[model samples]
Target chain A: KYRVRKNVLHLTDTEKRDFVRTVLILKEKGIYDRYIAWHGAAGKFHTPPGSDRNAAHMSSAFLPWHREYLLRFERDLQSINPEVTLPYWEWETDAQMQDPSQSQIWSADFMGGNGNPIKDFIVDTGPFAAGRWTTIDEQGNPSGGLKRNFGATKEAPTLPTRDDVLNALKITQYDTPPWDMTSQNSFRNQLEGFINGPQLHNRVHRWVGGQMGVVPTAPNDPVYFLHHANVDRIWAVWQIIHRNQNYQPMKNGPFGQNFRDPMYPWNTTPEDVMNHRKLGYVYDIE
Target chain B: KYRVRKNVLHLTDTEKRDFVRTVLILKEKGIYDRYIAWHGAAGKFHTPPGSDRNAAHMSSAFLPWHREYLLRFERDLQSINPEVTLPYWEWETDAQMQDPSQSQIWSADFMGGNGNPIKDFIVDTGPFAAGRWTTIDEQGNPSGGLKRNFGATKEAPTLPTRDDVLNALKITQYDTPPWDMTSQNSFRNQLEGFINGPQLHNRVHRWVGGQMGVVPTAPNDPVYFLHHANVDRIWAVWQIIHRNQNYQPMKNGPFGQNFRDPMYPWNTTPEDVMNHRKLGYVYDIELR
Candidate 1:
């Protein structure tokens, strides 16, 4: 049972219309400034500058870039009505089926795929696996044989449709049997595969204002909030399941080949994340 | 020109001995618990462990208290061996001189009430005279008020013995201007006169330790590195100049009437002492 706090402030139908109207205004104004530019064939989306390339790539620009764009839209809506905050829909728990088609807001052209439902992908390589090759410790020595989802180089097949995630969820039976115990390995493998293989990541970029270099579009796309809520939910689940995993980055290995460096994007070592308590925030199951 | 660099990893003969023989040995034995106990004391040689105090007083026992206590000891050694790493000293620079004796390691102590040695008690109250009061602002504020030394109270003056601190230095200075004009106050008064008040603030604590709850035993006074080297030098000259101004308490005011309130030991507002950079850290002429 998950405790879901319905954000007291939810957007109404009239408010949604105003939000869309504001976004149109901002689009007309072209007020976006490029602190950092993602050079692509289409054009550059203005990004906030950061200390270094890696930081610039991952900083608040990923959130605030889209937020400001969306706020420009929200501000226009507020001009019509004062009593509204951007309402978020908690999609993970309420949706009967994992299929995007089940969502009233989902449209064939929403994020630019095969106009199909969202599904899970399977990944074979990366730091999650073990045993095929020895994992190096910080001291440059082969500490021990790898464990968990290691050694499988051949990619597992992709699910290809939204029903696939639900099908996998059923097989793993996470809701009923606590899937973490029996099928954690396969589940992680399949999820990683889906995330890495697909241009889904690229598709997400395209959906939000033609590569604005951020996620979470304006209120027009109701799915943005639900998608992020699900992502945050997955992170919580992963933390519970993988709490004991230490940061074991490969030492002196070639870049991109070794996934254990402290500099790695997902290299949040146990020690680094240990102070989550000090941050004065907690995660909810929903 | 002042040279600021990343703190180097060097240890003096005494420092090595203390780190290894005292700190390290205690840590290994799991007896490092005493650090917390000594640190919890409310003032120099005063602590009421079982007493009922507000959250601010209790919480204060940990963060700033331990931070300053550890740093006072660290800065003293750095004064002697510039290369030695004063581990906890970073917070001192970052947070204002929350601890009382932060700048004391640089000045000399005024020797016994001698008219020839140029002993002086310099009080620089320009910060208060400028009508500056304490309040929290996101941006830094101008510091350098009497509160920097007195803490949050006007009573129970946190004044320390100038003679006692001078003896700790065990250094000799003959006919040196009590303090180079750099440390001296531009304005002086009989009730609260000072040549270089900031330096004296450090010296007073060197001998007596800070207000009621602070720890005694000169922070860096590990018996090897006599804390307050500069305090002794300042006192050597102050002893001859303004010897009459020693150990005077501030008049009672609306700020604090007694020493029991959290504001008693210090006379000025807490905001007045919130930053050290504003109070500034330039010392008098170097003895070397």
Candidate 2:
């Protein structure tokens, strides 16, 4: 619990610059693309080989898998700069903004502003604009550039509210049986935003639009780690509140969803990453 | 070395049945699909991103990656049945047959016969017949069934002969500079069937046709393991004869292609799998 991940808003100007620079180094070294590929591969790896549930999404492994992913990514970032840690984007607070695009986090020095309509939704403002950062498609081919179109869809007309997150945290169970998008009373499904269909995490993805709108290409945007960091924090808070509650479907679940079963594209099981503090990192609020 | 991988032809009636049954068990347990997905996943993972060379194929790591893939798959099979070991399909000898389709390996009891034209190249004659074995498309969705059309393409009209194998084995270098399909005087490209283009391993895939013809979907057919085993054996033999040669591009090669770099979709590197005997398995011919 030594490494404290701060809010994106709380990051010093230098902290933001360091994070951006370190990511570019990882990208140049050919290590960044592996994370994108790993996420896509896990999405395609159905837990039971015909079920709708995958190793990373639409299943019980979702929370733990992303936790492990962020842990590995944070460690990689630390390899480049020891002082740097993952920062969270509390979208719930940003939701209060009249024009969230004007949020300081979207400054030219940070994650950049909205996509340019003339350039086919290509991000052209900040450090990750069109010509600066490269992106890959779902098939792993170069897709030319990163893109973003905030609150573009009817399903996600606005960012998920702070109250929406509060409601999700109130849920006592870690996850429910059948452990999928349809799972009810599941904190995992709610935070994942599949309960009311794209409410929290899913809405954030849809609300961000562009590469962040989809699963395979979400990581292309630098904001993806920031957004997932906030999601992880919400889960971390829920873990604190429901101290006695354990990850559901401890047994009789699908191969990858089981408490001890290794997640696809990785050997780390849910059990291996259930506790955020034990993994050697904690959110700044902690 | 107790688990001796025998030639498909040498396997008795009972051996074939056990191999077939064990694969079915793996399929039933949902383990078989992971192999198919792993092979497909590795194909799209380019070594340095934006390069033609992938983690599994069209690169220096091709042999080592498949060796590891086959080793893991064979271990999975052993978990189901201890008596069953992966067998190799010596297509070089089978090439001598006037109609390679009639080879005993594709009998009704083993890998099954060729695709039925009336059913659009879907295999209808073996344990992996259309209805028996399921297949997945490039996107990982259910792809209906396994299919095979023998010697169906113009590029791969026939299998590589024993003489071709002998010539490939004669090469001194494991691989050459610019280690890809275009590298000249390279044993990896020659045996991988890109020297004269699709003459060996690639030819065998084309000869088998259907799912076997394409890199991403090749593992849909169980015979993919058998074919790769022979490729692995050839590399093993070259290792034995050369004695002094080492894996190429120990450093400075693209990530996932270097001797010590971990292959994509897996942590095992070329150096880790260089010695087949250390992997606790050997080919039947090694006994002599």
Candidate 3:
């Protein structure tokens, strides 16, 4: 019953304000008590530990982890409101045009551990871009330093304004559409470039906790679900576009032929993942 | 630590005799008091009700249902002989080119409600092929008399010899070499056919007092795990051969453009399945 609405980019201003306000109210209620939290405000809005070591700080944690985080939030929100559900923001829409910024529903203290005045006021740029600053160390850690390549024009990468991601989806650049397909390779590649891209990447300082990682308690942050709704949307889109590419390869030796393996929790296989159809609802695409 | 030895088929004659003897001993010892039984022999064997379905029949129980049954049997067996695990029979390997009439393991017995010999001496073909038979009309109900597919090859499909399945795997007829590399659409097509094909499908038959469902089961059946292990084995083989075909499609819409759904259980993408390098361990081509 709690379906993610299609074409969220087309929501009216009133709808956007209502959605943001609903998330704020839920944050105040302390609804996400037990489950893992997203890296939002209560998480101290800080870059997660160990993020700087990889080229893509948010790679491992972002999509799957946050997707679960938001779904939980949406379920809780549905318990109270019933009529409302979470929606995703396609930041790429505005991002492709190199938009410098837009007013975000969430913000956090940007100062690093040093509390330096120069660092205190830095604004959080986008969901993927939040985290603390780190020194560039080529050898020690791949994600070690600050690097920004937002766009040809030196502008910050804010939430793509629907158009950007839609444009990308229209073109068959990746095997599965970005949002719908859950392939790890495509996810890793996209996150690396998006985080490491010059225009958008550097705008949010790491000191503010811009990098993605599992945060134990921050579900109230609106960006958490909005970001993950987009992630779920990507998978839905991928399924629709590339319906042909569903099964995993079957091999003979150690692992099973199908990608379904190491059953539940620790070693989940494709077979376990195949029940999306049984989950009652699918994402909307317009 | 739990590694499989390659190319081994059936247990040695002494081992088989000892294994059956041990099971019988367990029965005498009442080791299976809590187990769900499916069959009862006035003087030979008895099975108890297990899990959800408590019918006297054997096949209606689910695959995992029977798997757990055998697991308990093996556990009791191991308790008696710590060093011994249950031996597996790769019937697929032995059945090829062999006469169905020649198998010494194949036996017949009279099974029916009290005071019925007209349906007596039903020959249970093998462990996997035990089930009851019924015919459904347009509305899907029993239209007439109940029967068993048993040794009736046309009525029930034949179980593949171990070699038949191995040959299917070896020839790459199911998919391109390294079946994993082929597109999912292609792979699923072959898999569905394989399930319905003659080599394996016909062996399923309804046993007296068996659980009622599409799949069949038998009391203390050892074939369940062996069958699934092969299923698991096929998945492993696919991954090794087609490494590049990993990762979900990448696009964005109502969903974000570059992310994956966590609702799915594996919590991984096609890419994760493809990169066995990330996951430790590789498969052995043969059981050495």
Candidate 4:
């Protein structure tokens, strides 16, 4: 792989500055908002109209869907600055700290600090402060100001630990029958964090708070990509460990979840993005 | 072109039935809703996020945008039934009738009759009746039955005349500077029906009230495609007469309105769909 995605901590001060600088260019050019709208659009697109499974989430397509999403976004970043590659946030290591909020990822030079309580939890520090960045609601209208309130909820007051991720890697099958959030012993389900109910991937969203706490509004926060990069990295590692396993529901699955079916709002199939290495990038540890 | 888009009046009973059958199949398969969502999404995607010009309408890209939209819809229809091609609603000819509502296009077998007043203007007579054909709002949620109230607005009580279409065709330039709703002597604005304010294209939308009255929800009514088919046909004819004229604001226009720029909600550009025949479809008049 020619491009290597490093962990957030491993990025140099210049690398961090370049990543944020490029994203701002994307936002000013109105390209960043397109990604927000695309994700929100896919969320509303139900697989069978009245079903719980959508083209993106609450189903087996979730992993592949975000994989394609991040890949496209990373490509856009590359278009702006070829040296800029997406970096993952190793939140599990941050959980080792006594105060995970004090992690260097939240420094003012980077993603910025937590939401100000007096300002209704609007993000006030770093590059994406309320005034520096603008946001849009689910209706695609200007909603004003990015917001974040990390680890303030009872459900998820901390980040997922290293052990939780290790358990997910132990999963043998890519996914099982039903191929939804309820699917048991499914690597997709476990990694998606629904196995223990908001244990890993879902827990991170809960912990981040603000727009990241919800579906349609998640991408409004730049951290959404960093977080998903880690999730993708985890999946990439799982792929190496279980070399023989393949994406489930090779047939007879829901329309968008099938290995060959075109994901809604996009024509790219799951099989098209199944190989992380062939996509021309690899995680740093790889 | 191998595919011939015919007028609604010329369609045989079986052809009409087959067309309606394929649309219902698309709807039942959860595919038709994607078209509605795509149209609605494009409406909100303003060219620069705060301007009047969008990827679809009120700009130089309007005709080509709808051309691409209809092409994709036709392809989807062909996927279901290769024999089925989109039929245009020649409202100008239908306007000649003593009562356009009485046209054969509204028969119970085809596009169904007017929305019933007793049912609060919900379409009740057609194959896409209130209960049979579900509708979605601009929010992409199920919004219940399809509705229509033909010629309900005083502003658009009647359809545009054949003379109105002929006058639009006489315009020389494809479009001029400020390629938007205000551009005078521009065929794009003239045929778009903003010259007299709801003159032709806008008039048809107002003439067919209910869901068709709005931009985002207009596609919910199957007539939206038929109406756009006629619009595309008119553009096709304009291309033939003004053989040397090209799409205006070829450069220096808004991002999505440029000839080579990709239209929002799709990768297609105005140049990509400028030629209707190259898309493998032609109007019945082209051959007849």
TM-score for each of the candidates? 0.25, 0.94, 0.33, 0.92
Candidate 1 similarity to native, TM-score? 0.25
> Per-chain TM-score of chain B, candidate 3?
0.44
lDDT of 4: 0.89
lDDT tens digits by residue: candidate 3, A1-286: 2365544565655665555555545433323322221122112111111112110123322333334345556666766676566766454553454433322322221111111234442223422222522221111111322222222233432433454344434433332212221333443224323523321212222211322212322222234355556655765575567665453333221221124432111223444443344433456554
Best by DockQ: 2
The clash numbers for all candidates, in the given order, read 56, 0, 119, 0
Question: Which ranges of candidate 4 are over 4 A from the true structure?
Answer: B173-180
DockQ (CA atoms), all models: 0.01, 0.51, 0.02, 0.38
Model 1 chain B poorest ten-residue lDDT run: B110-119
**Predicted candidate 2 versus true structure: per-residue lDDT over A1-286, tens digit per residue:** 8999999999999999999899889888777888888888888988676689988999898999999999989998998999989999999999999999889889999899999999989999998998889999887788898889999899999999999999998997999887998999999999998997889999999998999999988998889999999989999999899999988789888877889877777768888988899999999887
Tens digit of per-residue lDDT, candidate 3, span B1-288: 143312224445555455555654653443432121112110010011111111111111111222333344556776775544454433454355355323333332112221123544322342222253222221112223223323334533344555544444443322232122122333322322233442332243221212211332232333333333343344456545555543222332111101232211112323333332233222244334
What C-alpha root-mean-square deviation, in Å, does candidate 3 show against the real structure? 24.1
Model 2 DockQ vs. reference:
0.51
- Please provide, for model 4 over B1-288, each residue's C-alpha lDDT reduced to its tens digit, 9 standing for 90 to 100: 889999999999999999999999988876788888788778776766667877789999999999999999999999999999999999999999999999998899999989999988999998998889999876567887988999988899999999999999999999887988899999999999999879889899999898999978999999999999999999899999999999987888877788987787776889999988999999999897
Ordered by DockQ, highest first, the candidates read 2, 4, 3, 1
Could you tell me which 10 consecutive residues in candidate 2 chain B have the lowest summed lDDT? B137-146
Off by over 4 Å in 1: A1-196, A199-203, A206-209, A212-229, A241-271, A274-286, B1-288
Compared with the true structure, what per-residue lDDT tens digits does model 4 show for residues A1-286? 9889999999899999999999999888777877887888888777756667778888889999999999989998999999999999999899889999899899988899888999999999899998899988876778888888899999989899999999999989999989887899999989888887788999999999999999889999999999999999999999999999999889888677889988877778999999988998999997
